[PDB]
Design a protein around this ligand. Structure first.
Ligand SMILES: CC(C)C(=O)N1C[C@H](NC(=O)[C@@H]2C[C@H](F)CN2)C[C@@H]1C(=O)NCc1ccc(C#Cc2ccc(CN3CCOCC3)cc2)cc1
Ligand SMILES: [Zn+2]
Length: 297
């Protein structure tokens, strides 16, 4: 059977929040079968635990935020993208501050820390959410769709009226694409012209060329340039895989994003979860007949 996976060993990282600029200690720990991904504010007494599930999403303007009462965990999407990409079902994510560290702006550093620690297969069938019917949400020009598909593939289109903005559409299908090699290293991006305003709104306080592609009038300011010709749209795919993981299980289906973001992605997850005709939970007792496969642990 395709088995649930957790961490073999703990992961420790120290970083800075993109929006808050706060120094943060991150610990990933193994968790039991059917725990899912659970975030924990360990700086609070008592500790506040928030499951990484669509029901717990608050703010989606600046990044994906989990909320329980007045307690928040900001910017979960890059770490959730890493967990979904590597097939991690169960983990406790302890944080000493509200915001997950930004690292280099991609999922690359989290993927490397997790694969160094190693994964542990658990004695329980991995659960998958299988898309059975097309579910689409629109608002203005933006659209997010789930489509039935025997596998897992993600399409994204952005449209920035900017000289720097290259390939603005990309498709990944994990029957060929390596999450690790082709998606995970894609960094977040911000426009230089927006930073002053953002800082006045207490956003991008931790932003630097070390953790983001900074775009000037006409060029990327980063001295070493882009990791991928299509890094901007690859990063939107990375964000989308993280947001999709708020379903609490790996997807069997297709996601298509058309100028979508955290907010429409959340409207799409909420609409899917509510329409129980459009999905079911499936397991695979035989890996050899499954439409997806995962790296050795
Ligand atoms: C254009 C923007 C509205 C958008 O649609 N985005 C889609 C992508 N979203 C994501 O990737 C999500 C949301 C979070 F970004 C993480 N996951 C990307 C980007 C975004 O939200 N980007 C957010 C953002 C905003 C600002 C910065 C920055 C910065 C910065 C600030 C200062 C400095 C230092 N100096 C300042 C003076 O001039 C020289 C440099 C450097 C960088 C990064 C990301
Ligand atoms: Zn992002």
């Amino acid at each position: 059977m395709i088995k649930q996976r957790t961490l073999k060993n703990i992961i420790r990282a120290t970083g800075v929040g993109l929006h808050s600029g706060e120094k943060v200690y991150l610990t990933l720990k193994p968790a039991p079968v059917d725990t899912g991904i659970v975030f924990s504010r360990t700086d609070l007494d008592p500790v506040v635990e928030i499951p990484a599930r669509a029901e717990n999403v608050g703010e989606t303007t600046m990044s994906t935020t989990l909320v329980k009462g007045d307690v928040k965990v900001d910017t979960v999407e890059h770490l959730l993208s890493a967990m979904a990409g590597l097939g991690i079902d169960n983990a406790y994510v302890e944080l000493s501050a509200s915001e997950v560290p930004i690292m280099d702006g991609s999922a690359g550093p989290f993927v490397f820390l997790i694969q160094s620690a190693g994964l542990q297969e658990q004695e329980a069938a991995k659960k998958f959410i299988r898309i059975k019917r097309e579910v689409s949400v629109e608002e203005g020009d933006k659209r997010a769709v789930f489509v039935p598909f025997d596998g897992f593939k993600v399409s994204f289109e952005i449209d920035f009226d900017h000289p720097v903005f290259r390939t603005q559409q990309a498709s990944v299908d994990f029957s060929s694409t390596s999450f690790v090699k082709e998606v995970s290293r894609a960094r977040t991006f911000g426009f230089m012209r927006d930073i002053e305003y953002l800082r006045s709104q207490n956003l991008a306080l931790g932003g630097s060329v070390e953790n983001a592609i900074v775009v000037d009038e006409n060029r990327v300011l980063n001295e070493d340039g882009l990791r991928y010709e299509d890094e901007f749209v690859k990063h939107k795919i990375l964000d989308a895989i993280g947001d999709l993981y708020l379903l609490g299980n790996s997807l069997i289906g297709e996601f298509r994003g058309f100028k979508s973001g955290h907010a429409l992605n959340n409207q799409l997850l909420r609409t899917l979860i509510a329409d129980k005709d459009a999905w079911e939970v499936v397991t695979f007792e035989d890996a050899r007949t499954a439409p997806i496969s995962y790296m050795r642990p």
